Structures are given as C-alpha cells and as structure tokens.
C-alpha cells in the first residue's frame, strides 16, 4: 500500500514512534518518504547482494531473512516479506530495534542525508493524527 503523509504519520504515532528514542514524528515520516516513497512494497537490491525492504527499507543482511543473503543475521527474526505488508507493524517493531542499536536514525542513509537537521516538523503539519 502507498501511504499518504498524514495517514502514515498517524499509523506511526499509534505504533509508538513519536519521539521514540528522541526522534520526533517528523523524522520518521521524512525518512519513509525518501526511503520508499511511502510505498510498503518497495525493494532495493544492494551491491553486497542484500536487499532493502518496505516503507523503512530494512536491510536483509542484519534485520530480516529473505533466504538469499548470506551471513544473514535476522535480528528482528522475521521474513523480509513480512515488511512489505500494508500493516506497518512489523516494520515499525523492527525499526525500533535498529534505532536502539546505538547508531540512531543514522542507520538510514536517506535520513542522514535528507532529513537530519531540516524542519522535519513540516512533515506532519496539517495533519490531525
């Protein structure tokens, strides 16, 4: 499913993402936008052979198992296809572990390069939530 900005903002808030680990809502919406274009079905193949999945583009080398990425550690113990679902729960739950990893939202390159230090608030403005 392709989300709307506010539709995604509400779902993330309800799933407990607002200010999770210090990262306000605007950060998560901004990141989803540049990582997957609000598309739960997005996938991207990387050079090392792993693939990124879902709205938050969670990587198959450490976080999920896709049965084709060697050295796959599967930290959120879940098949990667569970992350392409229209119900963002699994992506949200796994996202929480990645952000608690110690590296913060720097784990998301699009966040680092396009959201870090911008008016991330603009992402949830005009939304009811």
Swiss-Prot record:
One of its GO terms (cellular component) is endoplasmic reticulum. Substrate binds at residue 101. GO terms for molecular function: beta-N-acetylglucosaminidase activity; identical protein binding; lysozyme activity. It is an enzyme of class 3 (hydrolase). Disulfide bonds join 6-127, 30-115, 64-80, 76-94. The active site is at residues 35, 52. GO terms for biological process: cell wall macromolecule catabolic process; defense response to bacterium; defense response to Gram-negative bacterium; defense response to Gram-positive bacterium; killing of cells of another organism. In the egg white and polymorphonuclear leukocytes. It is found in: Secreted. Keywords: Allergen, Antimicrobial, Bacteriolytic enzyme, Disulfide bond, Glycosidase, Hydrolase, Secreted, Signal. The keyword Secreted applies. CDD domains: LYZ_C. Its EC number is 3.2.1.17. PROSITE patterns: GLYCOSYL_HYDROL_F22_1, GLYCOSYL_HYDROL_F22_2. Pfam families: Lys. It comes from the Eukaryota. The keyword Plastid does not apply. Its main location: secreted. Residues 1-129 form the C-type lysozyme domain. Lysozyme C is capable of both hydrolysis and transglycosylation; it also shows a slight esterase activity. It acts rapidly on both peptide-substituted and unsubstituted peptidoglycan, and slowly on chitin oligosaccharides. Monomer. This is Lysozyme C. It comes from Gallus gallus (Chicken). The gene is LYZ.
């Amino acid at each position: 499913k392709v989300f709307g900005r506010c539709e995604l903002a509400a779902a993330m808030k309800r799933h407990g993402l607002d200010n999770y680990r210090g990262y306000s809502l605007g950060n998560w919406v901004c990141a989803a936008k540049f990582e997957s274009n609000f598309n739960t079905q997005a996938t991207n193949r990387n050079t090392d052979g792993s693939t990124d999945y879902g709205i938050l583009q969670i990587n198959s080398r450490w976080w999920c198992n896709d049965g084709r990425t060697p050295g796959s550690r599967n930290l959120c113990n879940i098949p990667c296809s569970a992350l392409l679902s229209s119900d963002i729960t699994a992506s949200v739950n796994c996202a929480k572990k990645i952000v608690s990893d110690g590296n913060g939202m720097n784990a998301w390159v699009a966040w680092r390069n396009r959201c870090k230090g911008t008016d991330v608030q603009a992402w949830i403005r005009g939304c009811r939530l």
